């Protein structure tokens, strides 16, 4: 079975009226839920306004993310792939990032190769293949910007990426100068 963390969604912006039961009744449509919880204050039992849903497979998570927007108890909620307790103790662990750096593409990789691969993760806003300003030569890397942050979340959890017969280094990019760990 797939590690549980890769089969889990953080659900933000919940109505305080949402319970474990109403959250299960909503999300049951896209797959088998192995866990469903609304986080609450330990003394007042008042909702903290977020929870988590765990599915039986990674494909069930993808089905639920493909069904966004999710309206739960009269509010459009904000589902995101759940970051582990250990990984949440990193700066910007929960930032929504829409751009990636793709390195190791050499000089023979064209925009269509990057597009045919990466578009399967989601709609692409831009593909920028980097060239040296002096020589005009390909630098062997590209930046891909997506329409939706979940496309990047799916990408960065994969151990490997192969584009046009090259094994790539893929990272989140804060800009064309700064890329994440």
Curated annotation (Swiss-Prot):
There is a cross-link at residues 1, 71, 172, 176 (Glycyl lysine isopeptide (Lys-Gly) (interchain with G-Cter in SUMO2)). It is found in: Nucleus; Cytoplasm. Transmembrane segments: none annotated. There is a cross-link at residue 106 (Glycyl lysine isopeptide (Lys-Gly) (interchain with G-Cter in SUMO)). GO terms for biological process: alternative mRNA splicing, via spliceosome; cellular response to glucose starvation; cellular response to sodium arsenite; import into nucleus; mRNA splicing, via spliceosome; mRNA transport; negative regulation of telomere maintenance via telomerase; nuclear export. Residues 7-90, 98-177 form the RRM domain. GO terms for cellular component: catalytic step 2 spliceosome; cytoplasm; cytosol; extracellular exosome; membrane; nucleoplasm; nucleus; ribonucleoprotein complex. Keywords: Acetylation, Amyotrophic lateral sclerosis, Cytoplasm, Disease variant, Host-virus interaction, Isopeptide bond, Methylation, mRNA processing, mRNA splicing, mRNA transport, Neurodegeneration, Nucleus, Phosphoprotein, Repeat, Ribonucleoprotein, RNA-binding, Spliceosome, Transport, Ubl conjugation. It comes from the Eukaryota. Involved in the packaging of pre-mRNA into hnRNP particles, transport of poly(A) mRNA from the nucleus to the cytoplasm and modulation of splice site selection. Plays a role in the splicing of pyruvate kinase PKM by binding repressively to sequences flanking PKM exon 9, inhibiting exon 9 inclusion and resulting in exon 10 inclusion and production of the PKM M2 isoform. Binds to the IRES and thereby inhibits the translation of the apoptosis protease activating factor APAF1. May bind to specific miRNA hairpins. It is linked to Inclusion body myopathy with early-onset Paget disease with or without frontotemporal dementia 3: An autosomal dominant disease characterized by disabling muscle weakness clinically resembling to limb girdle muscular dystrophy, osteolytic bone lesions consistent with Paget disease, and premature frontotemporal dementia. Clinical features show incomplete penetrance. This is Heterogeneous nuclear ribonucleoprotein A1. It comes from Homo sapiens. The gene is HNRNPA1.
